[PDB]
Amino acid sequence: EDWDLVQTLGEGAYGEVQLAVNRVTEEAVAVKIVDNIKKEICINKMLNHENVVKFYGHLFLEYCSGGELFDRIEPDIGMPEPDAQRFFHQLMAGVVYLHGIGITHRDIKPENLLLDERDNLKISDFGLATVFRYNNRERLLNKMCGTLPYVAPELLKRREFHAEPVDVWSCGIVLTAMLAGELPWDQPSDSCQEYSDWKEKKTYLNPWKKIDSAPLALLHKILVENPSARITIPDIKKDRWYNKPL
Ligand SMILES: CC(=O)Nc1nc2c(s1)C(=O)NCCC2
């Protein structure tokens, strides 16, 4: 049970992450080194799912030899549609799970989506995650959080908003990234030309031009500005592209 620090896997944020191999058993794990932290550990303790980075102790986290999904996205091209769909199915299984136990990640992006040895996707980094349901009671969010290109529009213009649609929106931006190798906009504000174009349905422009019509139909349903109108996860599960054999 005396781990060794073999190499640095990741850097940035308070601390840096390293690969830790057990001396005896030789189990490989990852260590996040930070000197906010109390909640991440708290939240991690609740998490048990095959599409969420496992929490071992304290941080000691499941090791993903696959790397970041981000590094499976060729710039300006994306990836083969079948891979995108499989990654999206798993991204959805993971989110359904978090929402089921009343947790929102709040920072979904390809940098926070890891892959294991069988290319299984793992939601990682709950440092920004928070509780949005407790005792069957929903709490609206009010703190602005995340990463501008993945963030939903309501987060920028409403004092308070629901947690789930914010996560749905960001999953859509990820899907866009997977099928086009580019992010549609710097942020979903009106001042942003690229977001205004999308609202006006100018889909002949990039990145939408690069996306087949079936997936794009789903992106039209996810990237809806009104969070009340935005598609929910159970309805994403019934979507034709989502259910298209590939
Ligand atoms: C490139 C890479 O492997 N980055 C990683 N960051 C982490 C990795 S891998 C990990 O294995 N587990 C939990 C999150 C920290």
Side-chain angles (χ1 to χ4, degrees), residues 8-10 17-19 29-32 53-54 60-68 71 111 114-115 124-125:
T8 271
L9 294 168
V17 180
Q18 273 195 271
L19 172 66
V29 302
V31 191
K32 187 181 177 174
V53 175
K54 284 175 200 303
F60 300 81
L61 305 161
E62 168 181 2
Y63 172 52
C64 312
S65 73
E68 306 181 352
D71 285 327
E111 291 94 335
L114 303 179
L115 304 176
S124 152
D125 199 5

Side-chain angles (χ1 to χ4, degrees), residues 28-44 46-219:
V29 302
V31 191
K32 187 181 177 174
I33 315 288
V34 172
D35 53 28
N36 274 5
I37 185 65
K38 293 187 297 176
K39 157 146 69 168
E40 182 173 4
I41 284 169
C42 172
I43 281 174
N44 265 280
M46 318 170 47
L47 308 175
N48 189 52
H49 190 269
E50 63 264 31
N51 297 133
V52 179
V53 175
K54 284 175 200 303
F55 176 70
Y56 299 131
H58 60 99
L59 284 68
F60 300 81
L61 305 161
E62 168 181 2
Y63 172 52
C64 312
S65 73
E68 306 181 352
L69 174 75
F70 178 94
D71 285 327
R72 307 297 190 91
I73 307 184
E74 194 190 358
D76 210 61
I77 290 171
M79 70 175 73
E81 202 176 286
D83 300 343
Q85 191 197 50
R86 177 182 170 276
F87 285 138
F88 193 78
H89 287 156
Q90 301 177 357
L91 173 56
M92 286 295 102
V95 175
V96 172
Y97 171 75
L98 300 175
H99 293 191
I101 69 175
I103 302 183
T104 175
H105 182 280
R106 294 213 278 182
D107 202 30
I108 301 183
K109 55 186 179 187
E111 291 94 335
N112 285 332
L113 301 172
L114 303 179
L115 304 176
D116 66 21
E117 54 280 1
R118 300 182 190 163
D119 276 346
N120 288 309
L121 165 155
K122 307 278 181 158
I123 302 180
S124 152
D125 199 5
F126 295 82
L128 290 173
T130 196
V131 167
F132 75 92
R133 201 191 300 112
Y134 199 81
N135 296 327
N136 204 50
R137 190 67 214 206
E138 172 166 16
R139 313 146 155 246
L140 301 179
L141 304 168
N142 62 61
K143 282 144 38 209
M144 276 192 303
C145 201
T147 303
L148 283 162
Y150 303 86
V151 63
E154 68 261 4
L155 182 152
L156 294 169
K157 23 194 148 309
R158 288 207 214 155
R159 197 174 60 99
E160 277 161 280
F161 44 89
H162 292 268
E164 289 167 297
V166 172
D167 279 338
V168 159
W169 177 284
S170 70
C171 295
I173 301 295
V174 160
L175 183 54
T176 304
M178 290 197 299
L179 302 165
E182 77 176 299
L183 297 175
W185 43 67
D186 301 322
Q187 78 188 239
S189 78
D190 282 85
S191 58
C192 193
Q193 192 53 51
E194 291 77 6
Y195 178 62
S196 299
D197 290 337
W198 163 255
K199 294 162 77 189
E200 287 169 40
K201 314 285 191 57
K202 305 182 178 169
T203 45
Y204 55 84
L205 303 174
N206 282 336
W208 324 109
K209 173 165 186 57
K210 285 178 285 179
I211 297 171
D212 178 77
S213 73
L216 183 60
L218 173 62
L219 293 165

